[PDB]
Amino acid sequence: KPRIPVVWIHGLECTCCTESFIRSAHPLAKDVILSLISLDYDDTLMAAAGTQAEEVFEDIITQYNGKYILAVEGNPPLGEQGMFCISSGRPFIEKLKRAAAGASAIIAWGTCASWGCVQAARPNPTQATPIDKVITDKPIIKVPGCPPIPDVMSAIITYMVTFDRLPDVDRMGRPLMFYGQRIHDKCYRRAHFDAGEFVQSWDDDAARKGYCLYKMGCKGPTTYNACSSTRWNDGVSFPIQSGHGCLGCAENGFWDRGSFYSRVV
Amino acid sequence: STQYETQGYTINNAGRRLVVDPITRIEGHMRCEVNINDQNVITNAVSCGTMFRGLEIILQGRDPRDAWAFVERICGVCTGVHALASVYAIEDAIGIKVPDNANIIRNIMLATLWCHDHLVHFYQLAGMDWIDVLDALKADPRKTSELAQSLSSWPKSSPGYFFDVQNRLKKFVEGGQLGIFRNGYWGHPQYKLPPEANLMGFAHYLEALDFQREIVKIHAVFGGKNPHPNWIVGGMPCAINIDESGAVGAVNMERLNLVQSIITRTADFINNVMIPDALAIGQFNKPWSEIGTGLSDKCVLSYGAFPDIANDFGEKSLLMPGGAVINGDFNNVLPVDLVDPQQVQEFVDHAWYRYPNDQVGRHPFDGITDPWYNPGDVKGSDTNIQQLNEQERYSWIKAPRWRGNAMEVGPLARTLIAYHKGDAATVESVDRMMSALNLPLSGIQSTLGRILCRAHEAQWAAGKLQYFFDKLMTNLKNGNLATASTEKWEPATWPTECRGVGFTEAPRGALGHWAAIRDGKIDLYQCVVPTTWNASPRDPKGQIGAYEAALMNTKMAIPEQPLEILRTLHSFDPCLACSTH
Numbered sequence: 062k063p064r065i066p067v068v069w070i071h072g073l074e075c076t077c078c079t080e081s082f083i084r085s086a087h088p089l090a091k092d093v094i095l096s097l098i099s100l101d102y103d104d105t106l107m108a109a110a111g112t113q114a115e116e117v118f119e120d121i122i123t124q125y126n127g128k129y130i131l132a133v134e135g136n137p138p139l140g141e142q143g144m145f146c147i148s149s150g151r152p153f154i155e156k157l158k159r160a161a162a163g164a165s166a167i168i169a170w171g172t173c174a175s176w177g178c179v180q181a182a183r184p185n186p187t188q189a190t191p192i193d194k195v196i197t198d199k200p201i202i203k204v205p206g207c208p209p210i211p212d213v214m215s216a217i218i219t220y221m222v223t224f225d226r227l228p229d230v231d232r233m234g235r236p237l238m239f240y241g242q243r244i245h246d247k248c249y250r251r252a253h254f255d256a257g258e259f260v261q262s263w264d265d266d267a268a269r270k271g272y273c274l275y276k277m278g279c280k281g282p283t284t285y286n287a288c289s290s291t292r293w294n295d296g297v298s299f300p301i302q303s304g305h306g307c308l309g310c311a312e313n314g315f316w317d318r319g320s321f322y323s324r325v326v
Numbered sequence: 327s328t329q330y331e332t333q334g335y336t337i338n339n340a341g342r343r344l345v346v347d348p349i350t351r352i353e354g355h356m357r358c359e360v361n362i363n364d365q366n367v368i369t370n371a372v373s374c375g376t377m378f379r380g381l382e383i384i385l386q387g388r389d390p391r392d393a394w395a396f397v398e399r400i401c402g403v404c405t406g407v408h409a410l411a412s413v414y415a416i417e418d419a420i421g422i423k424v425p426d427n428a429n430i431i432r433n434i435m436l437a438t439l440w441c442h443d444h445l446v447h448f449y450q451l452a453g454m455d456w457i458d459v460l461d462a463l464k465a466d467p468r469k470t471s472e473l474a475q476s477l478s479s480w481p482k483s484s485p486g487y488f489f490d491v492q493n494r495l496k497k498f499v500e501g502g503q504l505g506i507f508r509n510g511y512w513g514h515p516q517y518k519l520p521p522e523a524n525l526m527g528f529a530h531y532l533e534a535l536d537f538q539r540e541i542v543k544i545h546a547v548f549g550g551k552n553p554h555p556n557w558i559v560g561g562m563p564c565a566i567n568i569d570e571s572g573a574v575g576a577v578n579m580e581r582l583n584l585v586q587s588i589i590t591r592t593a594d595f596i597n598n599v600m601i602p603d604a605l606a607i608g609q610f611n612k613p614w615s616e617i618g619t620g621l622s623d624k625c626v627l628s629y630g631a632f633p634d635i636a637n638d639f640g641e642k643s644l645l646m647p648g649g650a651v652i653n654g655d656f657n658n659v660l661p662v663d664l665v666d667p668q669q670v671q672e673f674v675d676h677a678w679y680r681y682p683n684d685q686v687g688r689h690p691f692d693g694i695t696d697p698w699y700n701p702g703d704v705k706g707s708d709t710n711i712q713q714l715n716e717q718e719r720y721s722w723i724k725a726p727r728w729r730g731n732a733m734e735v736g737p738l739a740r741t742l743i744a745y746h747k748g749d750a751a752t753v754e755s756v757d758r759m760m761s762a763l764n765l766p767l768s769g770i771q772s773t774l775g776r777i778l779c780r781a782h783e784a785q786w787a788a789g790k791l792q793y794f795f796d797k798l799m800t801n802l803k804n805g806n807l808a809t810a811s812t813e814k815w816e817p818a819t820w821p822t823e824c825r826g827v828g829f830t831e832a833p834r835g836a837l838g839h840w841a842a843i844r845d846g847k848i849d850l851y852q853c854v855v856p857t858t859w860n861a862s863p864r865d866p867k868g869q870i871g872a873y874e875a876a877l878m879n880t881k882m883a884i885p886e887q888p889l890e891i892l893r894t895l896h897s898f899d900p901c902l903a904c905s906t907h
């Protein structure tokens with residue numbers, strides 16, 4: 062009858078991961094929130110602010126100590142004593158550590174929480190640091206992507222609720238179910254790649270026939286995610302299907318792996 | 327304590343200090359502090375951005391063609407708008423002209439964002455400031471049906487439906503697991519809707535949470551994915567093929583059919599759910615037409631947006647008007663020039679940044695982003711801010727000014743600019759809306775007005791989606807399929823040194839990206855973003871920004887429960903990751 066408590070916190074972020082979550086088609090995010098979990102704290106969506114929000118945070122982590130899931134969006138900055146991200150007048154990292162201490166497991170949503178993402182790209186002005194480099198004594202499931210696929214986020218949630226267990230993960234902590242294979246291992250343009258049939262400049266005859274984007278800098282060959290199979294926004298598209306090469310956005314440090322338009326090495 | 331005069335306000339930090347940190351139901355991290363007098367009226371307001379990432383620093387040395395992807399991640403709520411500003415800026419610097427279809431598709435991307443972002447803001451972000459969710463449990467389902475049916479033709483209005491929604495809420499709350507409703511402001515005297523209106527609003531909150539996911543399928547078709555679609559310098563990567571072999575690998579008739587279906591459904595939802603709800607909030611909350619005016623009767627700013635003539639950013643092309651009003655002189659809408667060093671300038675004397683001289687403002691081509699966390703004496707410590715020191719540096723947000731004036735940006739600002747430039751559709755819409763509420767025009771310059779204007783804009787944008795889609799189809803019927811210009815794709819074709827400005831109207835207001843290119847790489851990249859304007863800290867003259875001004879003079883019923891503060895702040899739709907970047 063009771064639903065599993067979830068605390069969802071936010072560090073340095075753009076909020077793309079919360080936005081992706083609410084795009085879920087099946088289950089609807091509405092149904093996740095009403096029926097599947099108890100989303101007990103979440104800055105972006107919650108009624109309470111300020112002292113009332115602090116009261117909720119403290120109440121949930123105390124009452125459900127050892128029993129809630131901590132979802133983390135964004136990441137802590139280590140620069141300026143952590144004050145590049147301030148929450149209730151104090152470094153965000155303090156709230157991260159408090160929330161992590163009582164969690165049964167942690168979900169690191171997105172490339173921010175998993176790896177660092179854009180704020181960690183050169184020269185990383187704030188010393189933005191992924192969660193697993195700060196929290197070292199808790200199960201952390203990395204769900205990378207900028208943001209991850211909406212229906213992947215919800216499928217991971219439903220798996221944990223339904224099966225009452227964490228998903229099996231690769232050596233980097235990513236769920237095997239969705240991150241076990243590369244974009245290029247399931248890309249519908251592979252026929253063209255293998256035939257040497259490539260887009261050479263935007264909107265050329267090749268582009269208009271859906272040829273491979275390798276020479277346009279596609280990072281599909283080095284990127285693990287579900288975009289070429291599950292696709293995006295209720296199966297409507299994915300980056301390559303709409304004509305742009307994969308940026309590599311699910312991979313650690315993808316921002317600093319050379320120009321998006323330079324070919325994979 | 328001190329007291330000084332600015333912009334018709336008396337800024338007085340005597341009296342009780344209240345802190346709201348975190349501000350929730352916004353994007354990102356914000357802190358607000360106020361002082362209240364013995365009458366529980368705000369006499370001082372302090373706006374603080376509590377995050378920074380440093381995109382302007384990270385962009386240095388990047389390939390200009392890659393820039394859009396980095397700056398898109400300034401914000402996942404206004405997702406796409408920074409990519410658009412970026413491709414505009416780089417194209418302006420290099421001297422690139424995009425094909426008509428690329429421009430039309432970009433306008434579709436922006437209009438899609440306006441619809442999506444405004445819808446989610448109304449329900450998921452601001453909605454619970456106006457709708458008492460718990461009070462919905464005391465509604466009569468039949469009376470709720472009667473109310474809904476009196477306001478709209480929307481089909482979903484049966485008593486059984488409202489009973490089902492109410493029962494779901496009842497079961498949700500019954501075990502004590504209130505989730506997002508925990509420790510809310512329910513029962514506050516400023517909640518004025520009757521129970522039936524609360525149930526109707528809550529049902530619509532849920533409908534909107536479901537429906538918003540569909541709108542962004544337009545971004546998925548043209549841009550691959552949402553959040554964070556893809557773009558290119560030179561146009562768009564979504565090559566079109568209607569009637570040739572391999573159309574399966576391109577934007578084809580089936581893909582365009584999907585887009586059309588989403589446009590129709592989006593307009594239907596906005597016009598028949600959001601619009602009547604906004605008007606209803608207005609009807610039950612008329613006193614809020616006189617609260618939170620702030621700078622909206624003094625200084626407002628729009629750059630303008632939606633160039634309908636490809637590569638023409640002038641007044642005859644932009645469908646959303648640009649202009650500035652200062653000193654309450656709405657009879658004289660002034661032209662805005664983003665290259666003019668005496669116009670847009672940013673100050674940091676009250677922000678956590680270093681300038682060689684913090685008493686002067688820097689135009690973004692002269693911009694500096696050198697972070698300097700220096701809060702001074704904050705009644706705690708550097709890592710424990712109990713009270714910001716607003717006499718010195720108190721925010722990660724820079725302070726933009728226009729010709730030295732503090733400005734408000736966003737839907738209300740745009741509406742006022744369009745109205746006073748004499749845009750016929752805007753004049754008709756605004757006059758009709760204020761007539762329906764039996765309020766004078768001045769009632770729009772308020773917290774309630776911000777909300778009404780935003781809903782109006784969602785309706786406008788949904789209409790423009792159809793207009794742009796039809797323009798696209800017209801070109802395709804004439805055999806004009808081009809989506810990218812690549813003449814100047816290669817760095818060897820670029821000027822050795824050049825600079826450009828890209829500008830638009832994001833959901834929250836006037837957006838500019840200023841870019842300087844040297845030797846094939848970004849030498850400087852400076853952003854001034856709508857919430858940077860609105861959430862601005864003070865300048866060397868002590869002039870206050872839009873949020874601080876809007877909060878001034880506000881009565882609070884219950885000081886410890888900041889509902890009035892949240893109402894006014896949320897009415898601006900704060901995006902803090904945007905403001906600080």
Ligand code: SF4
Nearest residue numbers: 245248273274279281
């Ligand atoms: S488009 Fe990218 S992922 Fe697909 S086959 Fe070509 S290189 Fe591989």
Ligand code: FCO
Nearest residue numbers: 404832833834857904
């Ligand atoms: N809308 C929006 Fe985001 C902000 N402020 C941008 O630009």
Ligand code: F3S
Nearest residue numbers: 286288307308309310
């Ligand atoms: S850019 Fe990201 S969204 Fe998928 S196709 Fe590549 S991992």
Ligand SMILES: [Cl-]
Nearest residue numbers: 230231232233
């Ligand atoms: Cl492995």
Ligand SMILES: [Cl-]
Nearest residue numbers: 176177178314
């Ligand atoms: Cl990374």
Ligand SMILES: [Cl-]
Nearest residue numbers: 419823824825
């Ligand atoms: Cl130039």
Ligand SMILES: [Mg+2]
Nearest residue numbers: 724852853854
């Ligand atoms: Mg800036």
Ligand code: NI
Nearest residue numbers: 401404901904
């Ligand atoms: Ni934003």
